[model samples]
Target chain A: NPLFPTESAALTLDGPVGPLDVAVDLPEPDVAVQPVTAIVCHPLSTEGGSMHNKVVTMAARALRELGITVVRFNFRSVGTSAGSFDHGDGEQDDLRAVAEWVRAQRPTDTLWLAGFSFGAYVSLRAAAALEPQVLISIAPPAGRWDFSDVQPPAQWLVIQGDADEIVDPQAVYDWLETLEQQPTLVRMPDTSHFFHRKLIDLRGALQHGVRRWLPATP
Target chain B: NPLFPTESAALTLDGPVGPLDVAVDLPEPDVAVQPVTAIVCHPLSTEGGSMHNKVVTMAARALRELGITVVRFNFRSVGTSAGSFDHGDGEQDDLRAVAEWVRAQRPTDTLWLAGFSFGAYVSLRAAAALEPQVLISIAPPAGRWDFSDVQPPAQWLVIQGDADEIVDPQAVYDWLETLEQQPTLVRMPDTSHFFHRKLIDLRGALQHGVRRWLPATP
Candidate 1:
């Protein structure tokens, strides 16, 4: 628990598998901090996905701008995180461990979970059990990943770029139709899997989507 | 000439081919402004390379920190830049046009040129005619591209990561030996062509390597 610093810091946490490299970004001193903490997950470890990923960092920035404390971590086998790819099985445990650490450090804060691509798959799978107050998934790998039995959180936001070359956008739309309790879906036009030039737009989309769910700033 | 704004701005410049997309980043207000401007080129237009590349951005950040106004532009066919890939032939014209615009606008500022990977290759090719006061090349594609006739600038800095998977590290070292007037070469151990998690280190390597060449702040 000591690994979670009082101030914004990049430190390794004791993960289920091994040390998980994590970066915590707090709101600026001028902004009123809210009693909300969000844990963001990175993409697949095999395809050079790490916590430093542009999309992952952009998502973190969006939350931080909203006066929310955001924590981004590298899953096992990514960056300095120890161990190899576990195909999202052991990776869920990795997420659980980080979420537990966040809860222990900020016990009163609302827990919001978010992820991009493969990270979304893992985070989505854990959302049913974790029951985050709000869950955000960007370009979730619906066809690539087994989202058959995954249950959505009470408040969920799914933003998918229609132009994504990697993950079929149609599959994501198709998957949403099957969910019993549907999450708010935002379809971005002319956006790629990486978001490229549309990063600022992505930031705006996230901010606008989750504005209502944000805790009151104090 | 009017395209280069007084303050940091992203604008389009008229090029030989068409309009060129550019981003200009200035030093902080607190920092003393130096009469120096640098145009940092992006990597290959093909293979998804653009001005937004993390490595290219880090290089731009390093120069900006040194009180230099840095301009990053996408090559033709990349991003909003006009035209298609000319295989480094017409790309040189793109660099030349941008450099001319910078010179025309600033007039007195010492022009510096820098690039990464394919960008490095194009910048190196133009350094002879452009005569940048300081030329910085990060992982210049020595083997992948034609560097046989490339002339080194009066004050040139070549930073190559030994672990570069794209460009052969040994090839870069080998090419350095053949230069008539060798540039100040910095061999970064455990670094990659993309620099990945080593971006901060890349920033340090550049700032440290070019510290002496920087113009005085006024």
Candidate 2:
């Protein structure tokens, strides 16, 4: 089976270079409250996902059951985090930095990376070196980009909405077409990129993400 | 009709004891996410109440509409706070200490205090300083002890279940008789003191606490 160790204290690094606040869950010490992390990345122009929308919370809870610690935090300029978006590239750097940080600090040999919206794409990129056993990309873009680089050692899972105009299923389908590897993809009916209009449908996708994906992942 | 200043960063403090931690909402913060605080306390064996329950979480959500900065924190040992549960006395000390802490920190004078079990009693004791316009006590052992000394400055509401063998309703009735002030007491039709078998019924009692008490106080 796929398993790893834990981490120590979370580092809350903030400054002009862009805020890098990470919450760590270390399974090594076997602490009473095991450390699990789910790094949270909100979609473009969205600020209140932590409270109003709680997908990260659900994911963290699910991973904890698998004996995995989940740490989720904001990207630059979202909430207390610094840096006002410099488009996708800098954001990707910010994400990769976190992955690298975890790779060094986490006692476990591997890490898991999951993201929503552009976060999904960026996280897919970060998974390259982190060698995430399970990489989840939710509500990725309609097109204009390629996560073709999300390769081996990383088993990708794409969850999408059929009717998501901002980011459509065809985009994911097209991305999958280019992938040298076959990653699992799950879709919801009559759904949009945000899934705000259909939360119930999102729940189904999330249940699949938790109960279905990790259980069978490489 | 009473009107709550929509965005008032204005805050005040009453020194109950120790150093209280408080942070008020921005005077003109966006209305997208209501400004509320979470005040938590442990169980009675260690303190006055145990906040490790749904009551505390749901209670915070209920105050969103009232424009009150709700508060939650462990008395000594629970959640992210410090201290070991030191019988009822140390817990009471913490209550007084935190009341002063919250008042000094929060930006809004519009406040509401909620306690699970130990917190309920401590909040009651520290009511004058917690000065929360309203107090919410869930599963308080009002039945076991005489509340003749338990008096709060603000309007109070206590919620309990009919089948709560842990607490006697008659004791609550007796305590109610002693108070010169009038508070609401809601009895769930078929619930226990802990209400282990009844959550939906407890929610009804909680909502009643909000409607009957929140509006009038805030």
Candidate 3:
């Protein structure tokens, strides 16, 4: 299998949901590719959270190793996704629309959604209806929302660094109060926003989560 | 195993010639255990990439998913890690010291190191000496130096969002030329620095790399 493989090109679409961009990266053939179809949602600003993020790259690496196809795109106004941030709630629609796009392209792959900070929240919100097999929430400012209603998918994982100052971990803990089967929480200690120095640590933790949802290893 | 599991934990011993402040996050045992270790370095500012950044927090989430352990701490001036920024060079010492610490604690676990921006360069430099199984560089402002001398470890993965204005992609591309192996470069189109929306892609890509480096599963 080629080390650097681009499974497909992006489909940039626009409409009332705003302009949307889509791209797919299929895992190598030999590996037992997981049924997971992953998607990446940029933060609220939608300034184009492309394929460059270490966290996103690392996540893709882990899932692909387990044989999963991945997808990512920009929000409307942000580079290509389209539209403007109508606060956090409005972005939920964009997330759902992207999920639909994935179903149309590779309907076989299991849909797994994830996003960073604001994007993480949006993806989580969308999962409530999409019912993805797995959901990943990164640095979600869950503290901002009333965690009471923000329930993650049935089998989901959440990673948060202890040193984070932006999002209150307490919010997730508090929101998780009522859940019957608590969502998994992976703690990142000695880390902060931007992960200026935690890419390696970040990469490792994500790998752990991916292994869970990934198809059985050979 | 719990979705969110504690992996492992350990402390550090300060060094003479390293970043102004050098703190480390050793892995602790968690239900969802992935032994991969990461070395996180703080930013250059007074905050020193506080563990509170949205980027760092989300990074931890994605990393844990991939089953990699992450260590994110401040350098001397930023947080508990003592000392001060001695230009970007000092950061290297912290990385070396952390490697030593991890080896002392759990020599069996395979080691992989990564960093963002300034820390990214430092991690790569140390990777040459450490020969880590994997190396990840994100949004590294490599233009400040001549990368021709930067010899990346055998396995390397470089990530950058196309929309990143803070870091010039040309600089990272130019630096990548120094690698001995044909490293995988995942360019998140339309994404800017910090990968505002790419936590999943990053996590997935990293998982793929670890699958390549990690010992075969039974």
Candidate 4:
């Protein structure tokens, strides 16, 4: 339902941009594999959502197990990557740059975008134009943030901790209620904003929730 | 482990290729998710291992449940794909073509290769050079095939059925013993080579065996 078509090329992989601190995890070389490249954004730069966030890295590991290529990068102004944090405005551009690069690399491969907290919020805003194969938002600050104009992806999953102290759980619920189409939501009881002891549980939740929905022959 | 620095390409997305009738499955795009992509080769194409074989597909499903991208394609003449069966020779080439495309598309993702019976034999043969992050073999034909030069990856997993009608369990065990490093082996006592009634169990087994090994916070 997005305005973009399957062949949308608004973004190109070779687009000019300063190098962002990007971490790429690849499967050993073999010829029979086609992987979906994932762009994982960390939480708020103001509060330390660099690519190294435990939640972000855990998410990356979960994706890697499934053999998906994961790209975890520092948002603008964070770490050694160029550019200052422009709140969420410039951050969207940062995501676009990463997505375009992924498109350029694997033209035929599917693209995925994921974020935690602030990262999740940014990914939601960019989903419309990006049209990723799958979108993952973990503990998105749905209530506090402005999600009024955001467009959700076709396949989406939200992993939120019921006991999350940082992001309001009720706000997420309220935000979802406003959307016509809701995502497959999993509320992790006793889980905090960072997942802590339940990180493994989060991994299992992802495998169980998103398994059947994925394409087997693709 | 390969000499390339962990920060190989500072976010480079790039690749080329011919056609192979490739089938792909992807997680729908909604909000927050990235999955590892898996490419599964079927049993002997000459016999009847198209990409859609029951065991092959079941394996695909199992991996999919783990939030992994699953790709199952026809090997040469097996299905609607072009070309005749080339034993394991050209088939490796075809598998390589697919793997290259996958790498190109998801350069940062870990590639996982899986096969059953003859397909397993072929996957093992390709493992030495492929150096996939994870290699999965189901009922690999140990005695019937030559694995003299095959060097399994560190995170290798082999699932075999003791009741296999085609591949001998002891032969598989013997073949495993010959290797310097052993794969995490799971022996399905009641299951057959085809998995018969144990497909669900096979799925569960994969989730259990593969979950912990996957990066939790990659």
Candidate 5:
């Protein structure tokens, strides 16, 4: 294994569809921690969404503040990854495969799953199978996609933008109400589905949401 | 001309070589300024440097903090800019063409030139002719590029990373020592040629270096 000078690496892995183009961002040595890793999924693959999406990139950066490893990847067809649009099933399989790979590589590391929009839907669906320690779903399209089976992890966060033009806020709130295990939900006022000008606020929210769960800098 | 939504636009401009891919970042409506704009150039185009370089992006971001328009472009042969590598002459012509384009686009705004590495050297060469109001060069390869006949602008800032591995730090300082009208020089200790982990420092240095030089945000 080539030692990544900046503790980050561009990786490709065996995924459900084919090879998953992945970007692994590791914490700096001063803030490094082990036993915790995160996998961040982007929005809909059809909407030109990929690992490089600003929202996804910011989420990864926010996760890095917790002193752990974060992985952002193109789900199957998006970017350089091989395969066609899998709707949601193959994407979920991709997430599960990544989660399993993370487990096998680190073994002791606890998994954290995060996503935005369509990505959030897939992550929530895969949460039951992956059983991650921490789950973060931003602007989950509760009405557009089936979320009846979402089983929020022990440490879960759900953020919805009240002004999201794409995802219905009422549907999201209604879905959150139906969940048996309630997550720490935050509704951002005047925030778009893409977070738009409120990206800095989104970062603040993520950092705040995961503060207590963060490992102390070594 | 269509008003740029979200205060930014991706553009392709005519260059000495061919088309230059550019991204223009404007200040928010509430904070918009007039009579001042900036053009930021990236590092060595041969080394895969483009408008997306972290340093170039940060420089643009810091310039945005000043509430002025910032233009970032890929030099000839990089990104969508069509051409083979042009040692230094054609690259300087590219900078001059960009400066003219910026002036024509915003006839009332004063032009600002800023660049990193080889980009910095070309900006310096173009400075005497363009005569920009403000010039900011970070990690300019002073010795490698002949600076003997180079004339410093009235409002010029030269920030070199002292710990730079690619460009000789001492050589930069030595060249600065030989200048008739010295530029406002900032030597960043523990900063690499690319700024590496010191990117935030670079941004801070930029924000600080040009604080008073910047136009007030409206």
Candidate 6:
């Protein structure tokens, strides 16, 4: 279970259902390495979301730019991952399995969790138990998915695109208002669910939003 | 002028017109390093194109996956690069300046060139003089740009989306038919001008098309 890589790499990891396709991207050599590693989740699996989603990749790239080791994985049933769609039930276990691997591999490093859309929902649902130091959610499908059981990390960053076609921007805003301890919410104007031409802008937003929350580089 | 970095970096280099913004991405650490370097040009500067184009970045990523050092730069008048658009005339000089820098920095390494759309046109125009070991032109604007002066390298790979809206696909086919020595042409189906959701497909096509021509690892 402690098969995390020292350098950037792609490999399969045992999951609750079956093997999960995973890719790790390390920070540039010159950048000071921080004692933090992030796991980034893709969008909805049924909608053809995989670890290679542009938004997911951009989020991973932004975190790596800030010297955080990033891990991106395909949900069960996506790509080489050996399973079928399991709604949100089994997906949470998939995230848990990956987080466990990260924790076991890098015992001393701080665990950070991130997800996009359905990925956000699964990660948010498990945050109360996992208790990551930092959590990032991009275009989290608030109204579409059940958030009643969700408990986000104390230090959280939520980025929502105003013009998102699938997820209602107002629903995300209303959901944030209900939280007693609100996460730092970044509302991107004129951006969409897929990010399209605004990927660089999304990278900028994520980097700027989480800069304060990042642990000091060692 | 030997300012090429040993590690991946973003820096400005002196261009014929002014300073040029550039980004270099190295192959993953585990991959064997090849004595080959590629300079990737962005699409049309006038049409919101620069080093950060999704297609352009995917191309660079694909080449890096093949153990080649890939350099991406903004054309004159784009991004942080200074100077106004001089049609393709000044853009050619920008490419020449970057290629020259690569040559000076890694004298023994073989030079490889790649570009998308307007970038493809610029690189194709200079391929004769640059004499790159490998040339990759994506969605080359055949009828739109005067390809009369183009002299592609003997080992060239031309990838054109069959459904390209901006550039006529048939025109490219016709242009290739007229060439005495034809380059390897890869026609991607259901693809558009910017590649849209097909960026991964583009990467696969590029990697497969050029794998045989890659220089041996050192």
The sequence of per-residue lDDT tens digits that candidate 5 reaches over residues B85-203 is 88778988888877888888788778899999988988888888899889999999977887657665788998999889999999988877877788888888887888776665676
- When 2 and 5 are scored with lDDT, the better candidate is 5
Candidate with the greatest TM-score versus the true structure: 6
Docking class of 6: incorrect
Residue-wise C-alpha lDDT for candidate 6, range A44-128, written one tens digit per residue: 8898599998788889988887789999999899999989988888988999999999888889999999999998988888898
Q: Which stretch of 10 consecutive residues in model 1 chain A shows the poorest summed lDDT?
A: A25-34
- lDDT, candidate 2, equals 0.55
Q: For model 2 chain B, where is the 10-residue window of minimal lDDT?
A: B23-32
lDDT per residue for candidate 1 within B89-178, as digits (tens), equals 888899999899999888999999999989999998988888889899999998888886766678999999999999999998887897
- Tens-digit lDDT track of model 1 for A134-169: 999999998888987777677899999989999999
Per-residue CA lDDT of model 2 for A76-116, tens digit only, reads 76666677765566676777666565555555435677777
* lDDT tens readout by residue for model 2, B31-146: 22333443544456433343344556445534543334544444555443455655455666766655555555556545566676655766676665456666778767675543
Evaluated against the true structure, the overall lDDT of model 5 is 0.81
Error of 4 at B60 (Å): 23
TM-score of each: 0.53, 0.43, 0.48, 0.51, 0.53, 0.54
| Clash-forming residue pairs, model 6 | none
Looking at model 3, residue A64 earns an lDDT score of 63
Judged by DockQ cut-offs, the docking class of candidate 1 is: incorrect
| Candidate 3 local lDDT, B1-218, one digit each (tens) | 11212434334456654332323333322224566776655444443365445455445545554556676655445555567666656667666766776666667777777777666767777776787877877677767744556667777777777778877888777766755576788887877576654555555555565556654231
Chain A TM value for model 2? 0.71
Deviation in Å, model 2, residue B170 alpha carbon = 39
Instruction: Please identify which of the two predictions, 2 or 3, would achieve the higher TM-score against the true structure.
Output: 3
Best by DockQ: 5
Clash list (residue pairs), candidate 5: none
Writing each residue's lDDT as its tens digit, candidate 3 over A1-218 gives: 11212546656654357576666667744455565688876665744355446566656655665567777766656665657766666677777776776677566767888877777877877777888888887787776754445557776887887777877777766766657887777878777755545655665677676665665543
Judging by lDDT, tell me the better candidate of 4 and 5: 5
Q: Give the poorly placed runs of model 2, Cα more than 4 Å off.
A: A1-11, A14-16, A21-37, A45-67, A152-154, A197-204, A210-218, B1-218
Candidate scoring better on lDDT of 5 and 6: 6
- Show how many residue pairs clash in every candidate, following the order shown: 0, 45, 114, 48, 0, 0
